[PDB]
């Protein structure tokens with residue numbers, strides 16, 4: 001039992017020689033330079049996140065180029081994620097950068113497009129057209145992931161509403177605005193979004209963080225929009241609204257993964273309900289064998305301070321205990337004063353939580369919750385992990401070209417690193433949202449197709465050797481197909497490493 005397991009732990013228990021959890025950073029003013037990115041990668045960033053609700057296409061293009069350059073100069077593969085606007089509502093530009101909203105003050109909200117690039121503490125734009133046909137005198141308007149609330153007092157004209165500032169908060173350019181329980185009839189994939197998705201495909205991004213995913217059909221709308229050229233691009237659906245939680249099963253089965261988008265979620269549903277929602281969505285994803293991200297406000301105060309709060313240390317550790325593949329930083333890296341320090345802390349907390357994490361129980365729990373009969377390739381993966389535990393193997397090697405096999409093995413949570421030897425560079429990047437996997441690139445162009453698997457295996461074992469995971473005389477569990485089978489891995493072997 002967890003209780004019994006807690007009594008085995010100590011504060012002096014030394015950490016693992018590898019970290020399983022992966023860290024996602026959002027790139028902005030604080031972190032866009034090729035120098036600042038190399039600091040992020042060295043601190044522990046695996047995924048660069050571009051928020052397409054800010055900046056511009058030319059701005060994010062610079063990010064793309066800088067990330068790739070910074071990564072090439074460190075000799076590492078780094079995933080580029082495109083974060084959609086989605087069916088969302090945002091405020092718009094303020095004069096001078098920011099606007100101080102003070103407790104008790106009265107302001108105005110206009111739907112007139114003319115006020116888009118000119119906004120103040122007294123009058124500013126909101127891009128939802130039929131806002132006036134939704135809110136009445138007395139209702140609340142939520143601003144900046146619900147941190148700021150405005151009470152509508154009266155209707156000034158056809159497009160302006162008199163408001164009251166309920167609490168003191170400073171807001172910046174284009175703030176997110178939420179209308180809980182209103183049924184905002186914004187399209188599944190907008191005319192703006194279709195340009196952004198077209199942009200990501202052209203630039204060859206690795207994954208899409210799709211915003212405000214409400215239905216399975218909407219996920220199909222994104223893939224339809226992505227087109228044939230970008231079908232290998234991963235759709236990671238963001239759950240941040242009420243019906244997104246309700247349709248979670250059908251959403252998960254359509255997606256390539258999930259983000260628990262707690263910022264928008266923690267306003268759209270009651271804040272205490274986000275804990276339960278997080279426990280459910282993560283576990284559900286773990287069972288499905290699809291990457292899951294815990295996001296938003298995890299080390300928030302480190303946007304301003306060199307050290308986190310006790311709650312923030314706890315939050316990051318528990319996301320790992322929950323079973324998240326990834327932990328994400330937003331404003332901490334986008335516009336924070338300690339971008340390297342924050343990612344360094346996150347890695348340090350992830351590694352510590354992993355120490356106390358009971359991967360064997362994790363493995364068994366997941367094993368029990370799978371439909372029997374399993375497919376041959378899933379059974380191979382499950383039983384390979386079983387071998388690891390029985391033999392105390394110190395590394396695992398998987399040949400995977402699409403990433404399918406590597407994620408299937410990771411799904412069973414062995415207590416050793418998974419070394420994926422892949423023939424594709426996008427697979428190296430894409431597996432950066434999968435916990436406990438390190439990729440090795442095998443250039444089948446110049447080195448050969450390797451139909452006998454021998455060369456790719458030897459490359460996985462050498463990687464694991466050079467990382468210090470295995471020594472001469474250790475066991476290493478190897479997964480791939482035999483001489484005949486194509487499409488999946490039908491074979492497992494335990495080999496003595498030289």
Ligand SMILES: Nc1ncnc2c1ncn2[C@@H]1O[C@H](COP(=O)(O)OP(=O)(O)OP(=O)(O)O)[C@@H](O)[C@H]1O
Nearest residue numbers: 026027028029051053054055172264330331334335
């Ligand atoms: N590309 C960018 N250019 C300028 N500022 C940015 C950029 N990306 C993020 N920021 C700033 O840092 C903050 C980071 O938060 P985040 O990236 O989560 O976006 P958000 O506004 O919270 O919306 P969401 O996270 O729901 O997409 C943003 O609120 C924004 O003010």
Ligand SMILES: O=P(O)(O)OC[C@H]1O[C@@](CO)(OP(=O)(O)O)[C@@H](O)[C@@H]1O
Nearest residue numbers: 400401402404405480481486487489
């Ligand atoms: O790309 P995924 O779907 O992970 O499949 C990988 C599996 O397919 C196989 C079967 O053919 O490919 P490969 O030809 O590279 O040998 C297995 O060896 C490999 O483990």
Ligand SMILES: O=C([O-])C(=O)[O-]
Nearest residue numbers: 261262263264295296
């Ligand atoms: O996208 C997010 O992370 C959110 O809305 O919190």
Ligand SMILES: [K+]
Nearest residue numbers: 053084085211
């Ligand atoms: K967004």
Ligand SMILES: [K+]
Nearest residue numbers: 354355356357
């Ligand atoms: K452990």
Ligand SMILES: [Mg+2]
Nearest residue numbers: 211240261264
């Ligand atoms: Mg969001």
Ligand SMILES: [Mg+2]
Nearest residue numbers: 263264296330
């Ligand atoms: Mg956010």
